[PDB]
């Protein structure tokens, strides 16, 4: 039984397999890999100033800890202070979570985490460890500013958010909800991006606020060379707040970053990979979305190469308010065997999308024909590894140029094989039926989820004068009959119109998509599944959803009335929507299962699938697609936060059910990821063992080079914003 | 955007 804000010791640990993909490379292609891994590891880093006010102190901590004495030697000096091995294990995998998180929040849920052991026994370890004896000062320093937050789970230090009852940096502790939407008001009347933003809220001695929106570069308050960036950088007058737009985020760190990807480019395989990495070096020395758009409009002609990769502040889920970017980057090996039926199905992907249930004036314009590939991955920095992903986030590019997805299959992999003594809230004639068809069932879902669910739809967009990019005069919106009165006006994105439920609300759309779209036999046959494993995956797809949809509990915050994570709460909305269509399809069952324990049990019509559930998932598809389009965010909210609504209605009684969830949930697998080293002219692979202390060692020579410097950077970094919370 | 699989 897992206890909440706590990495259990037994917590699964697996590694990342790399060995055959990176075994292909040549050698110019190996040195190209290096160098932006090293970039990815360096900007990963500033995950940490965007996660907690403590997370920098604590990664430099761990890291002085580790790097003068491993695992292995810690252990002799742990024991020999009183700390038994179930304690000093319990250390050791915070640290690995603290590591794979890059904070000490997990990104799959957004809930703080802290040590399984008692403080004072911990402080023993520390203050007399060998890192302590070659630097007293900067070790007691760091214990004496991060050792209470280590610990501490006051309400208000639980879950990531704006507010007085929860945690985050992208703003300063005194930011409300408020203040965002005020900011992004901001933002988009000076077209402005948040990916690359944060906020923070100062009081005068009047006790007038003052806002400054600090963008993510190298460069400071110094002049340069650009004037897009430069022009911006001054102080402003809106609705009667002040607002000061200045630069130089993380600066040292992504000095590190623009240092490896300038070297990498050395090593470019085209114009098309050499010119993109020129347009990040200028996002990110000068701070500049457009060079990074830029780069990125370059990336997605790059088709099907060998190392693949993306880097920079992508995705908004983390931000409480939800546009501004978390930094991530990855580098992988396009896997050409696995990459074969993705192609497959973008190659008749134009005329699937012909079978969403949305009229053609909903969807793009032209099909785009993105690449799709199957993945080894080799690095992925941040603070979690998905499954796929659906890039860039640009709607301007997703919808005119072009689009790229990416199937992470040595992701997949993890999680292929199931084991039947651990499956939960499963009717035990499903079991068998589940576990040889879960792990393909998901790959298609991934497949579905990116290209035909992400990459589908339009925006009705009109720009500062009067031109719509769809005729009004002739589109009609198919809910009420009327023509369009609802759109996108310009500088407004999908995140600055919806906001705090604009992720979730996306990943409900794909994820809708991915379950109406497997129905189709074509897309089984492009996967290899035909006649009765046809049926058999299609069956277990709409099980594993309906069985996610109450796990997801275990990601909702009852106090806070509020949702952490987004394609949890997705699911939860379709298990919602289908519980909603009756008819017998899906039933809820409070149980008490061998444990002697509560738990709950989850049944599925198979017969009433096509009958029952796809007319309601294709009723609720349709009116998804039409408020998002439109941009009705009033209309979203209402149909979106509805079902996303929970409560102790019988016959479910969800919030009873919650507690169940918790009570037999499952933690996350880490992931330990593998290091490239260099000798000169030839790249070797160095891989770790599948467990904590193997999580710890794949940091500790993550960075031979400059190790002790990155800990001083990001303390000062840290200090410098110390004021803000 | 991002896709995930749960449990994992
Ligand atoms: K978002
Ligand atoms: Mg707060």
């Known amino acids: 039984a897992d206890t909440q804000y706590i990495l259990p010791n037994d917590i699964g640990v697996s590694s990342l397999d790399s060995r055959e993909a990176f075994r292909l490379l040549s050698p110019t292609e190996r040195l190209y890999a290096y160098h932006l891994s090293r970039a990815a590891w360096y900007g990963g880093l500033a995950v940490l100033l965007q996660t907690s006010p403590e997370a920098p102190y604590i990664y430099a901590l761990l890291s002085r800890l580790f790097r003068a004495q491993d695992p292995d ?77 280590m610990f501490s789970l006051e309400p208000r230090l639980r879950h990531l958010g704006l507010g007085k009852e929860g945690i985050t940096t992208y703003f300063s502790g005194n930011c409300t909800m408020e203040d965002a939407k005020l900011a992004q008001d901001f933002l988009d009347s000076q077209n402005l991006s948040a990916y690359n933003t944060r906020l923070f809220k100062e009081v005068d001695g009047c006790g007038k606020p003052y806002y400054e929106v600090r963008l993510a570069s190298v460069l400071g308050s110094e002049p340069s060379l650009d004037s897009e960036v430069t022009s911006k950088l001054k102080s402003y007058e809106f609705r009667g707040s002040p607002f000061q737009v200045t630069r130089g985020d993380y600066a040292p760190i992504l000095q590190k970053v623009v240092e490896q990807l300038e070297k990498a480019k050395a090593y470019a395989a085209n114009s098309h990979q050499g010119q993109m990495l020129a347009q990040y070096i200028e996002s990110f020395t000068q701070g500049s979305i457009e060079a990074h758009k830029r780069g990125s409009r370059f990336w997605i002609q790059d088709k099907g190469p060998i190392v693949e990769s993306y880097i920079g502040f992508i995705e908004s889920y983390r931000d409480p308010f939800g546009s ?152 009609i919106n198919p809910e009420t009959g009327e023509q369009i009165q609802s759109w996108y006006r310009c500088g407004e994105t999908w995140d600055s119109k919806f906001s705090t439920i604009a992720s979730s609300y996306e990943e409900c759309r794909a994820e809708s998509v991915g379950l109406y779209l497997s129905l189709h036999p074509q897309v089984l046959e492009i996967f290899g599944f035909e006649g009765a494993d046809a049926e058999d995956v299609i069956y277990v797809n709409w099980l594993n959803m309906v069985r996610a949809g109450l796990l997801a509990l275990e990601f909702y915050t009852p106090e806070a009335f509020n949702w952490r994570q987004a394609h949890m709460q997705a699911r939860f909305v379709i298990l919602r929507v289908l519980l909603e269509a009756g008819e017998g399809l899906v039933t809820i069952t409070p149980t008490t299962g061998s444990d002697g324990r509560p738990d709950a049990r989850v049944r599925l019509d198979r017969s009433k699938i096509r009958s029952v559930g796809k007319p309601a998932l294709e009723r609720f598809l349709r009116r998804l697609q039409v408020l998002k389009s439109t941009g009705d965010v009033a209309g979203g909210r209402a149909l979106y936060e509805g079902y ?25 697998k880490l992931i330990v990821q593998p290091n490239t080293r260099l000798e000169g002219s030839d790249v070797q692979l160095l891989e770790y063992e599948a467990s904590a202390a193997g999580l710890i060692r794949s940091f500790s020579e993550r960075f031979p080079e400059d190790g002790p410097e990155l800990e001083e950077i990001l303390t000062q970094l840290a200090t410098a914003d110390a004021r803000f919370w | 955007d991002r896709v995930y699989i749960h449990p994992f």
């Open chain 1, 73 to 149: 030697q810690l252990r002799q000096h742990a024991l020999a202070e009183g700390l038994t091995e179930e304690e000093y294990q319990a250390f050791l995998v915070y640290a690995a979570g603290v590591y794979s998180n890059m904070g000490n929040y997990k990104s799959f849920g957004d809930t703080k985490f802290v040590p399984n052991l008692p403080k004072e026994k911990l402080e023993r370890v520390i203050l007399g460890s060998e890192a302590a004896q070659q630097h007293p000062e900067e070790v007691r320093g760091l214990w004496q500013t991060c050792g209470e937050l």
């Open chain 1, 324 to 475: 501004r970017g978390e930094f991530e980057g990855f580098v992988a090996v396009v896997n050409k065997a696995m990459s074969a039926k993705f192609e497959r199905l973008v190659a008749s992907a134009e005329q699937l999308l012909k079978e969403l249930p949305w009229p053609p004036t909903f969807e793009k314009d032209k099909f785009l024909t993105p690449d799709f590939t199957s993945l080894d991955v080799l690095t992925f920095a941040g603070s979690g590894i998905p499954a796929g992903i659906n890039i860039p986030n640009y709607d301007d590019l997703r919808q005119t140029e072009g689009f790229k997805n990416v199937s992470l299959g040595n992701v997949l992999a993890v999680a292929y094989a199931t084991q039947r003594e651990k499956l939960t809230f499963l009717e035990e004639d499903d079991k068998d039926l589940y576990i040889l068809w879960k792990g393909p069932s998901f790959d298609v879902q991934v497949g579905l989820h990116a290209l035909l669910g992400h990459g589908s739809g339009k925006l009705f967009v009109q720009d500062e004068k009067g031109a719509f990019n769809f005729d009004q005069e002739t589109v």
């Open chain 1, 644 to 668: 996303a609504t929970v409560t102790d209605a019988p016959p479910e009684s969800f919030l009873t059910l919650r507690d169940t969830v918790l009570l037999r949930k499952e933690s996350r």
